[PDB]
């Protein structure tokens, strides 16, 4: 049977019942022991309400807002008799404020994004830097500095950000084994960072190819995606963003850094979902990805930073997303950016609408002695349907990661504010792996120089194939 | 019943029986009187042969090459006893060499592209300027100057290039009429150029949106299009090219001019099918087009050039393609450029495989008093099926233009080498319009600066919305 990892003895307050809430609820019911009615779902959507009613869960049809979130959430989180768990899977809500509220009230917390209150992402008076995931993440790091320890709150623990942090650790272990690098497995951040350095890992792509195909053709003036349309558009219109490696010797003219914070990132003055990068996955082989900003682009580069005694970085990997979403989402971005405005309507593909495909999601570690190594999940829609309900393959990678984070938090409930990079990666992957389909490590001799230069002159650097100069599509 | 325009008393030699040849054959049979034994098709393809056999037409299964074209075509084109007609709808053959051969032997000639012999388009030894459509066109103009007059030979008379030159003339007349300007239409090149100047037309997009959708989802590693995949990929890997307007105040760093020739164009040192421009059509409204090189980008700009007494251009419109192909072609380009190689296989969508959609193809005249005006054809797949066999909507705009050019040629026997800009636009549109669906003119207040600047700073020129600086996606 399915493993039951823990008992939960307090309220489980799920904020949001979109594609990820819908996929996560069945895993929570499956893998935890608790009186069923301790679970309650909060979502303003009529669609969400109807689905929640069919699943027989307490449902509160309300938008969580800056004005109401304390009045709304505290009674739910503190109902007792035991410790509650806030499972935040929403858009338009402040991750930071809800996290701090849960912690004030002794409730566990998990989310999959550092989301702001409604009005941030398209605020015209905000500087591009302030709209960056680096900036959003720095608010979480500052919160941790302000109130160290206390109740566990897990930030950005979905598939990516989230699971991919655990993949990076496993990939580093595998590379070390394959390259004959000796020593016991790292047990501290500094040891992980030095292992990456010693292996010669210049950078990392979060290298993803979603091949899920719908049973209907893309409709005109409809944004189609396999997960949040609102969320993908939000991150897609944020600046392109990357963890910035010490080996990089070029940045584009419209790249900018940060005056404060962990120091691990740069951003570009252009939207990430209209920024292309050359990348690679096992099934796609060479492909374009979009350089969409992601928390882990910064958190992984930060985590793997080696500093000298003076606090200066001597090593840091480049790290960023290289996302090839489903074909209908590729068309949706072409339509949105070509129109200069969001489509009138949108839809998220249901498993019943998907005719085949996989969400191939892994980490591509490059620059080392075997050139490039991709490690990750090749989960298909067919396998997804066999092992978890109410979601597609994109959804299941995310929901299972939330499941893993919940198990970790319940096992470690007084660890304070943590990121996916802070968790025990083996324990998390132990929990998650039943839901990931084939999990494989693949070497390739592909580099961003492949086939180049072609018929035209290009701004390339063939002395160093993996330079961002070569990866960025200009 | 359908009109029969003319008798053809000599051989009709069709070179090529791909998507355009298959669509053009029935129109030639429909609209001209000739003994069936006079028409013969030449194509090396087995698939083409089987279709030709099913249609009861003479078929010679042979590739036309530099080595064999004289030995093959001179007898066929002079079989007699009257004047023959070479209808060249092929790839990998020299338009110039074949048109000169037809002329030398008194046969009429028409084609839809200035195509070179096999070995030219992907030659990395040739400099990008020499691979340009500007340069190919100059060879045709030179041939005309060296042997003026003689047998009529029509260059680049498909939908675009071709028909869209007629649309520009009709659009100019319409713009004037809509302003309350009465009187004689232009009758010389110089007068057409002056009309464009006088109306304040700053530039022209060949503004196309193909919404034909397939009955099957796009296959991986298959290039899908609604017309020649080989031809589209070839032009798409040529440099981006555009007729260059006198109003333009900026060009990109990798733009280059031509040291000789008509002077009307520039090219970019990058492939046109991976170059995006902001544009507009009635059904698409604001969209991205690809800046794919096209003969008419140069020929229309050249045609509409006004020079001073010193022979210096004082007015010329910008003119270029702004192509949004069918959704599966958009995905095919994303795939080809992202992988850095041509797909393993390709297919052209048959009308039986198209569930709906239109080929909306027109000219967008901008910069005048009513800002922008789109004039052109909205041909649906539904309309296409009602009125012509063996083709989709893309095919029928092209095949009907070839029909119109043929009627024109038979009515204008000794015209020498002519461009679509040289043809009598009202006569050609009279013949073509039954096959075009609605031919409509639509004003819009949209400009490339709609919604800009937005969330990020941009190098835009707010003093002049239609500047290429604002159009080009950078
Ligand atoms: N880390 C990852 O791997 C990952 C992956 C997918 C999604 N995400 C994030 O997870 C979140 C959920 O994604 P999804 O695919 O379920 O999105 P979705 O768009 O399907 O659902 C979002 C839900 O939030 C609800 N909502 C909107 N405003 C709200 C408010 N004020 N209070 C409460 N609920 C509100 C909506 O009604 C909707 O049901 C998004 O923020 C998304 O960016 C992270
Ligand atoms: N101006 C326009 O609007 C326009 C529009 C569409 C196509 N075109 C041009 O028309 C031509 C045909 O397009 P299509 O859609 O029919 O292309 P297609 O790829 O469907 O067909 C091309 C045909 O040419 C044949 N061919 C190849 N080599 C040959 C040779 N050496 N001799 C004779 N035939 C040969 C092929 O076997 C094939 O059947 C292309 O050059 C294309 O660029 C112009
Ligand atoms: N349904 C619940 N609330 N808990 C179920 C425990 C796990 C049984 N598979
Ligand atoms: N420093 C450079 N320019 N190149 C370094 C390249 C290292 C790849 N062997
Ligand atoms: N089949 C021909 N060759 N010509 C036919 C023209 C008249 C058809 N109604």
From Swiss-Prot, chains A, B:
Gene3D superfamilies: homospermidine synthase like (3.30.360.30), NAD(P)-binding Rossmann-like Domain (3.40.50.720). One of its GO terms (molecular function) is homospermidine synthase (spermidine-specific) activity. Homodimer. Pfam families: Sacchrp_dh_C (PF16653), Sacchrp_dh_NADP (PF03435). Its EC number is 2.5.1.44. InterPro entries: Homospermid_syn-like_C, Sacchrp_dh-like_C, Sacchrp_dh_NADP-bd. Coiled coil: none annotated. Belongs to the saccharopine dehydrogenase family. Keywords: NAD, Transferase. It comes from Blastochloris viridis. Involved in the NAD(+)-dependent synthesis of the polyamine homospermidine from putrescine. It comes from the Bacteria. Its cofactor is NAD(+). The gene is hss. This is Homospermidine synthase. The keyword Cell inner membrane does not apply. The lineage of its organism: Bacteria, Pseudomonadati, Pseudomonadota, Alphaproteobacteria, Hyphomicrobiales. It catalyses: 2 putrescine = sym-homospermidine + NH4(+); putrescine + spermidine = sym-homospermidine + propane-1,3-diamine.
């Amino acid at each position: 049977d399915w493993p039951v990892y823990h008992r939960i003895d307090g309220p489980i307050v799920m904020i949001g019942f979109g594609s990820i809430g819908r996929g996560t609820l069945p895993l929570i019911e499956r893998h935890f022991a608790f009186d069923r009615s301790k679970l309650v779902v909060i979502d303003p959507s009529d669609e969400a309400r109807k689905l929640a009613e069919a699943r027989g869960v307490r449902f509160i049809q309300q938008a969580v807002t800056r004005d109401n979130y304390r009045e709304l959430l505290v009674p739910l989180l503190t109902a007792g008799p035991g410790q509650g768990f806030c499972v935040n899977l929403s858009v338009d809500t402040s991750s930071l404020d809800i996290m701090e509220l849960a912690r004030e009230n002794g409730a566990l917390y998990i989310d999959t994004v550092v989301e702001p209150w409604l009005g941030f992402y398209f605020d015209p008076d905000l500087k591009p830097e302030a709209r960056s995931n680096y900036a959003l993440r720095e608010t979480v790091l500052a919160a941790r500095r302000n109130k160290p320890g206390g109740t566990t709150a897990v930030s950005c623990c979905g598939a990516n950000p989230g699971m991919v942090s655990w993949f990076v650790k496993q990939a580093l272990v595998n590379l070390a084994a394959d390259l004959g690098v000796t020593g016991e497995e790292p047990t501290t951040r500094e040891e992980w960072a030095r292992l990456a350095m010693d292996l010669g890992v210049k950078g990392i792509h979060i290298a993803e190819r979603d091949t899920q195909r719908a049973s209907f053709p893309k409709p005109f003036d409809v944004f189609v995606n396999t997960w949040s349309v609102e969320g993908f558009v939000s991150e897609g219109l944020q600046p392109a963003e990357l963890g910035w490696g010490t080996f990089e010797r070029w940045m584009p003219d419209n790249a900018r850094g940060h005056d404060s914070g962990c120091g691990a990132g740069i951003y570009l003055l252009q939207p990430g979902a209209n920024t292309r990068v050359r990348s690679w996955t096992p099934t796609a082989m060479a492909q374009y990805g979009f350089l969409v900003t992601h928390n882990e682009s910064i958190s992984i580069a930060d985590f793997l930073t080696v500093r000298d005694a003076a606090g200066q970085a001597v090593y840091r990997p480049t790290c960023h997303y290289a996302y090839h979403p489903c074909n209908d989402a590729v068309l949706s971005l072409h339509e949105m950016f070509g129109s200069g405005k969001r489509q009138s309507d949108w839809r998220i593909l249901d498993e019943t609408e998907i005719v085949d495909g996989i969400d191939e999601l892994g980490v591509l570690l490059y620059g080392h002695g075997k050139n490039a190594y991709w490690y990750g999940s090749q989960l298909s829609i067919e396998e997804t349907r066999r092992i978890a309900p109410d979601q597609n393959a994109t959804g299941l990678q995310v929901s299972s990661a939330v499941l893993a984070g919940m198990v970790w938090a319940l096992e470690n409930p007084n660890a304070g504010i943590v990121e996916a990079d802070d968790l025990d990666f083996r324990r998390c992957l132990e929990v998650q792996t039943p839901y990931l389909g084939p999990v494989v490590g693949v070497y390739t001799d592909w580099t961003p120089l492949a086939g180049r230069p072609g018929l035209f002159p290009e701004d390339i650097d063939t002395s160093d194939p993996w330079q961002f100069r070569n990866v960025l599509v200009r």
